[PDB]
Design a binder for these strands. Structure first.
Ligand code: NA
Ligand code: NA
Lengths: 72, 72
DNA sequence: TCAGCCTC
DNA sequence: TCAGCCTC
């Protein structure tokens, strides 16, 4: 119902696995759920990288799982 | 029992599919069966490319199938 | 995931 | 097969 936000963290060397070829993999996840999903560049000394999900309660929920399924 | 030969033909753009990364895929097939498997370069006007299996009756037989399974 | 794997 | 996919 209400439009909120979350931030997860995955290692910088799982970036390629879940982004996709010309970033086609991520585009799939975005349009499927309707979650505003954004992957960040790693800081000065950063093994992890932030993912910034942004939709309603439900829109965010699915994305949580879908972004552990191109790690397959 | 007796050591013989066969030649199959696949399109030149199925070469990559069955050869493998640094030709690791083909090396697998060779040692598995014991067949002397060799993939050829395409002639002046050649859509196909020859594969030159060379072992005993049995050694050759398996290779026949295994070289239609990296086309998967 | 799903594209491209070119070797003795 | 089985590696690497870097995008709104
Ligand atoms: Na799901
Ligand atoms: Na077999």
């Amino acid at each position: 119902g209400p439009i909120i936000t979350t931030q997860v963290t995955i290692p910088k060397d799982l970036a390629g696995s879940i982004i996709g070829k010309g970033g086609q993999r991520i585009k799939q996840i975005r349009h499927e759920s309707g979650a505003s999903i954004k992957i960040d560049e790693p800081l000065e000394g950063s093994e992890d990288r932030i993912i910034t999900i942004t939709g309603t309660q439900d829109q965010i929920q699915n994305a949580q799982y879908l972004l552990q399924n191109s790690v397959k």
